[PDB]
Amino acid sequence: ASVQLQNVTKAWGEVVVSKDINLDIHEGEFVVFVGPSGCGKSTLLRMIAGLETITSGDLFIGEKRMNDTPPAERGVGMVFQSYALYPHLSVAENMSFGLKLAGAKKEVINQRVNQVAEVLQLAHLLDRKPKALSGGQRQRVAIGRTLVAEPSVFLLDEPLSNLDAALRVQMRIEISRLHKRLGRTMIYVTHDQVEAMTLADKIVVLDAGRVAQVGKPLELYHYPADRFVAGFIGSPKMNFLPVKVTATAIDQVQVELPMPNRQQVWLPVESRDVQVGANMSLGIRPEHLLPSDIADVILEGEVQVVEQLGNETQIHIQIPSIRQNLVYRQNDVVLVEEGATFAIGLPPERCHLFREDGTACRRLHKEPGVA
Amino acid sequence: ASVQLQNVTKAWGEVVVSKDINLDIHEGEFVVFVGPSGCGKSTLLRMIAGLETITSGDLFIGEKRMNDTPPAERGVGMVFQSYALYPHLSVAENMSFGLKLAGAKKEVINQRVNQVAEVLQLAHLLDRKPKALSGGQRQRVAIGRTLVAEPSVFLLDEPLSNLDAALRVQMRIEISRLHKRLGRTMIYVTHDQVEAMTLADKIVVLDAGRVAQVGKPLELYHYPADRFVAGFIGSPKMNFLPVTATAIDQVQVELPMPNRQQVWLPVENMSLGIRPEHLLPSDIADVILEGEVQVVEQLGNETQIHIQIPSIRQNLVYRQNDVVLVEEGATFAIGLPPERCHLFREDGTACRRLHKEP
Amino acid sequence: WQSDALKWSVLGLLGLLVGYLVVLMYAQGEYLFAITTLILSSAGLYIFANRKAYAWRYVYPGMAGMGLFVLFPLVCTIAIAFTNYSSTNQLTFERAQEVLLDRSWQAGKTYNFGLYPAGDEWQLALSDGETGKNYLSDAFKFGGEQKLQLKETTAQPEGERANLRVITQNRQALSDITAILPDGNKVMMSSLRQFSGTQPLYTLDGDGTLTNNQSGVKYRPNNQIGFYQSINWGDEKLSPGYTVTTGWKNFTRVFTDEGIQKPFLAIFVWTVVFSLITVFLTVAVGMVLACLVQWEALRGKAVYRVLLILPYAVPSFISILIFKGLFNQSFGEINMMLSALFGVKPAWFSDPTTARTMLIIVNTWLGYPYMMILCMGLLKAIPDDLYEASAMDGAGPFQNFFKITLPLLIKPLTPLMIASFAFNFNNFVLIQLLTNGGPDRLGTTTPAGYTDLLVNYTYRIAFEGGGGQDFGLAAAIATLIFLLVGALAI
Amino acid sequence: KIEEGKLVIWINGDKGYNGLAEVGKKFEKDTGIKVTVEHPDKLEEKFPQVAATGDGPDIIFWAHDRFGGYAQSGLLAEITPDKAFQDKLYPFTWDAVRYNGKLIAYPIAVEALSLIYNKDLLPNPPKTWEEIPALDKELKAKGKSALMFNLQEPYFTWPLIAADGGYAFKYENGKYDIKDVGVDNAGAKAGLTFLVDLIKNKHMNADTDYSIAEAAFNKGETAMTINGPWAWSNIDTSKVNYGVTVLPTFKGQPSKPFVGVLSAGINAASPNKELAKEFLENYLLTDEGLEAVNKDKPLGAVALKSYEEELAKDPRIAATMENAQKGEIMPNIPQMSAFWYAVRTAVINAASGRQTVDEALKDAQTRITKASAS
Amino acid sequence: AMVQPQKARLFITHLLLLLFIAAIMFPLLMVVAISLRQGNFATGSLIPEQISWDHWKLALGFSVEQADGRITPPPFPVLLWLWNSVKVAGISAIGIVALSTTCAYAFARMRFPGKATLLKGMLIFQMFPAVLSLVALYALFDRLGEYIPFIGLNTHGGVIFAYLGGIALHVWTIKGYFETIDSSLEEAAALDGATPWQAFRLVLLPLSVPILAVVFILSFIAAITEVPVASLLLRDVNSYTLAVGMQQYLNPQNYLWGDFAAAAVMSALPITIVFLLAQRWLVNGLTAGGVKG
């Protein structure tokens, strides 16, 4: 069902953990919430479920104002961040509890519990209590209890955080297949950047009580509205270098790198509200830096860190007159030592630019995949 | 302090949760445990803590047997998978709990508490009780409680699992900083591969309660001992294909696709394994593999492509850098490199790869 | 599904028993009991009627119980404090009048009587002992008030003398006969064997005045003190007195009476201290024992657990008295043991401090199981992983107790402890049975002793002290010590 | 409303209530009036509460001292036995059951303390208190002691204290003078001095209580004790060859124990007063009626002259009645409350050595005199 | 589960418990002694010199051949008293659990105006001195009796009913405990569509099982040992509870100690069984595995 928040505020005394938040989740929409630990992702889910009061503003689900409705009467189901399993009941009973409350038949209950248990790989653990399970098992139990219930609105608070990589892949698919079968609204909180990119119809980025930006996955990756969003989506983080405006065209901005040579480069980025001489922040992603051998703008420096991931190599570089190390990602196992000299290329078409207030000069290079 | 296990077994009555595990962790070593959910990572860790009993086998900490020594007397500290915070105590009071116990020095306590809370970005939460915290914030209080105590052995069970990407990066770094500055043994459990790769001096891979392999990060990645490790280290999972002639220094096998191509592999009914990162564009390679695109996932930094191949039951996952515009149902071709191929016997064991990786 | 109709049905059915039993209480005369039962039932129905008063559904049964058997008694006890309800004034005014109007005096002669059948009618004989004369009536029938002319005789009557049984069955009709002697004296039945000139001592004038038909003296209601006093008041007062309102008189009497106030403060201190030490020692002894007896390494625990509560399974009355024997200064097996080992004989009743120690020892023995049993339950609310954490923090058993176990218990124990303080404050029974309050506080005009609580010394005043049992005084003191312990919960 | 045309009786659980029920069964056979006997716990406190509201038993059996209270409260009928009936009972008993100069109950049995002695240790019992400290010295040689009694309760020590002019309230002439209290005077001090001196000389112990006293007599450890008729069955089970005799004399004068007269009163609210009178006068208070109750549980000494004289063929009962007659009727006035505590305290103070006899009793007089006034 | 240490601490605990138990058992062993002593004597040796089975025989229904030869039938039905005690105490206790649990639930989980005043009113008002209470109570059950005679005077019903008001403290005890349990279990329950009643019965109660045993026990004890109210309401000998019946042994001048003691010891027996039985609900770790944190 549709879920809409209008000027939703939430305060604990004088602490404001949600400020004026506005969201329009349409029916069947898969929406992923992301943001820094402690920003308000669970507080939002709890206000939707009805487990926390709303200070001011209006919550609408399926078009009826829900601020004062009891939780049981919202058509909302939740996979709590804390799991909140019934410790006196076994896996089976945990997963079949919501059904038993309805007048559900035993064979109806058994079919759709055994079924959800085998895709979650909990089949051999049906009999155990929550105390006799691992953290990743307990977490699956929590998922599986909401899956059997098939509510109108799924809330999943960080539901894969305690799973091995491989299983995390399988669960992602099952949640995805479910959302495609039932076509029901799903609100999904995660810290894993891959989950966000692969599951979301729309991603909401929150920052300390506010919505930072709502968008399609790729729309957020390529065109962050501001420095925070840019620094939050994609990991390893986007590099930032201070730069000076030198010249402006309606369609492009020219900047001066802070190195002693003071190299200049044009960027395909709006010049709206950009004055010559101002200090901007230039962003470039580790994936988007280029090897030096074939490049117009070269940055060179001294390696501080090497991280060998197997599939790739990440190299952190101290480049003179910039405080923060540059992070660069090379495919495959590149053999480089700490302290070595290293140079990378900086491609103008993939550079972002942020005003002093941290707002983004809209990138005008049309990046493939965003329509 | 050093920590070594010797033929350690652990039974819940008759369910074996640890079988014959042998580990040498040298003083100042950072060891990470990885393995599927429910394979016995927390159990192992808990046996080192002393929070669980060892059924048979020897455990030694700093060259002395500890099987019978109680948790409080082992010189160990732990970040719990479920945090296990004191609900009656503030963040400050939770963090200062260990120190307060063994020689409370007012100022010393305040100082090490403020310092650790700053790196954990917890400085504004010092007065709160655990119920008024977020899940990730509570996770960091648990971490703070152990770091502040500075035990001889640090045990950390999935300590970053509920932190955002950017804050996780920062926490790995600080955990590393502290591992170099103290030079004390750290045993660290995680499901994040990047953490395993970047932190570990040694990775211990676990499977259903037994040690599948132990080695350097890159060692396990390039040279896995068996099918299970191969499929467990590196995500996305290594692809597997069910593969005639056998040279005296390399092996030759046949691809199951209805053309039946034959290729050599620099190694010792096999399973052939190739990682999604190691597959090549079509035009480059000799051996070409072609099928229908099933799933395309746009990750921003890279594109991942699932390809259903004729006669091959399992989809083939391909990773390629940057935003690649490909659509479901389209035809896709990729190169199969022979020197980057893995090979596995009918039982599970790997044929040692002889191609030297950098 | 149990029908939706079935709700408004059962609610209509029960709301009918209400009325059937309420208007039925309005009859004969039960008005306080009708008004009270109306508000209580009506609240019950409305609460279960609209689903907006949901939560009250859970509270209402319990609160109704409490109002009925806790609150109501408290109200009456307070009410009583504004009246002189006592041994001396125990009857209502109506009952006292009724008693006085049943009083009699012998006005004339006394004759043994006989009942003799004449066919199917009766004959009445009287016998004048003091002259040897005998009288006999004509044949008459039983029923209603009738007057009988008795005539002097020398003859026996014809019928056989009737039984006591026959006299008894006909006692009502017999008691309605006025017999008249030849000489003009009226005489009525005064026992099963005698007819006499017994007459009502007082007559009701109807304007309120009672007048004695023997002395001629006159009496009116004096609602100031609650007696019939002579008439403008005389020196004489008629018992029984009646219960009557006295405004603040019982409350002031505690404040105005210098002499009942000499040891007040000093006794108060001891009562506070007695309560505190008891609560402390019982919570502490009980909590530790509960901790020890849930310790899984402790192999005897299931047996220990049982044996440790037995002081509470046996009624305290015999136990207290056995302790009184146990503590006997010269005899009694405690000082006979302290004789042998330690060579001392503590003066457990003679010496104020050692008496207080004795009382506190006995009280702790009585009270620790209660605190133990509470802790046995409360201890299950503490999750086991908190001690895994403490272990990983380098905690011992002693440290566990004081940093985890004690702080996690004192919160839910706080109300139970405040209540145990109030109960032990008023622990009248223990002191009475054990020490009687002694030893003696010398120079206390109204008598007090060193181990007396406030309750012990105060009810000595109301119930002993020689004025009979003064219920009003005791009720007022009960309210005063209640407003004092209520202000002590600050 | 007490139910008309039947009789409900309350009597304590240690009386022969089954015996009384057979007397009631006879009464029913002769009258058709059913009699029901009850023995509820704390009936002495229960009665005042039910009777005030015009309910309760038609007849109540308790000791007389409590009936002065009920009478004052307006709960007891004024009874009227004729001179012929009154002659059948000992005249001193009729003094016990009077309120404001009027009879309010029928005396049934008489109770008082007597001297109990071991015959195998002490064949000829001493007639005087002064003889005892000598007698303890010759017993102490053979390991025993002369006399142990309850030194803690004034009821048990008052006999000696009273012997020489110690008294509660002056029993003038039917009236008890509330202002005239005799716990301070010369004979009280003499009584209490003789007691203190027995402890001073270690013939007795200042903290000998009921329990200890009884246990020592029943084990043959002390040659004599002071105790009531309720004690005999323990001694019978113990098989101590024992006698009950007159209490020893103090300065040539009789011990004066307190006298408890078991009495039957008619509820002022009863519609069955005449039935009650008949039951009590002509059925219970006869040789045959009293023997029915006695056989169930022994009444001790009874107030009915004729039946006492057959009971008295038992030396124990004779002894009881003798000590009764030479003793003090328990005053039935409210002011006796104050007496008990004040006196109990004074004895304890003097025995334990906290106060001397003089000031102890001076203080106890002060406490009763000012309680009885204000 | 945890690796245990020094077993010198167990030896010292066993030694201290044993010494504590002997000390607190001594007074009760003398009650047992009084019950086995011939005659009725409050004092004497721990093993009575002259042992007697008579007091226990009369308590258990047996007749006693005495010294002169005549047979003494049991004067009182002590065993039926005991059964009347189990019934009054058991039903009483069930009712007090049921009434205080439901009450604690509203106090612990729901919100309603003046909740705090009510809770503090509840604890305050039960702490008023019970001195003139029995006057009010009698007058109450006298009235009630003519309308619902099942709960009037001389009925077990009335006695049971009288006790059901004594809940204030048990309410705070269960409230207290309810609050140690994490809200999120009933929160989750509510999102499974469970009613507040269902959440109460199906989730919260099973986890609160130890504090349910505590209040059941504390109530059963109170009821068994209770004298004043039961004695004021019960008239018929054959309806007496054991606490009321044993009062017969107490007279102004002496006590039938032997019979009183046998009665006293007997009354501990139902307390002991109820205590033994309730242990099955006194378990640790009921909430283990439920809430990460």
Ligand SMILES: CCCCCC/C=C/CCCCCCCCCC(=O)O[C@H](COC(=O)CCCCCCCCCCCCCCC)COP(=O)(O)OC[C@@H](O)CO
């Ligand atoms: C005035 C006091 C009178 C008390 C008399 C009691 C009489 C009984 C005789 C026994 C004397 C005590 C002997 C102690 C022996 C050591 C106990 C022990 O060695 O055993 C410990 C048991 O703890 C435990 O009773 C905790 C151990 C208790 C230590 C604290 C005792 C201090 C006493 C004062 C406390 C004041 C309380 C304040 C009340 C307001 C082991 O527990 P741990 O595994 O660490 O805890 C975690 C788990 O148990 C969780 O379930």
Ligand SMILES: Nc1ncnc2c1ncn2[C@@H]1O[C@H](COP(=O)(O)OP(=O)(O)O)[C@@H](O)[C@H]1O
């Ligand atoms: N009961 C509470 N009182 C005050 N603050 C709270 C309370 N519970 C949570 N918070 C705070 O609210 C903020 C948002 O909480 P939450 O939504 O749990 O964070 P997250 O976005 O990590 O899920 C956090 O910074 C946390 O400290």
Ligand SMILES: Nc1ncnc2c1ncn2[C@@H]1O[C@H](COP(=O)(O)OP(=O)(O)O)[C@@H](O)[C@H]1O
């Ligand atoms: N008390 C128990 N009884 C039986 N099996 C248990 C018990 N506790 C945990 N297990 C099982 O032991 C296995 C290993 O647990 P754990 O070490 O927590 O796994 P992980 O590797 O995910 O940390 C799991 O399959 C788990 O369900």
Ligand SMILES: OC[C@H]1O[C@H](O[C@H]2[C@H](O)[C@@H](O)[C@@H](O)O[C@@H]2CO)[C@H](O)[C@@H](O)[C@@H]1O
């Ligand atoms: O405090 C000593 C005291 O303990 C017990 O009193 C309990 C009582 O049993 C409970 O029912 C409740 O009312 O609280 C009291 C303790 O606060 C003993 O019953 C009592 O004899 C003893 O003095």
Ligand code: BEF
């Ligand atoms: F803790 Be396991 F990975 F579920």
Ligand code: BEF
């Ligand atoms: F700390 Be939050 F739940 F990311």
Ligand SMILES: [Mg+2]
């Ligand atoms: Mg959260």
Ligand SMILES: [Mg+2]
């Ligand atoms: Mg784990």
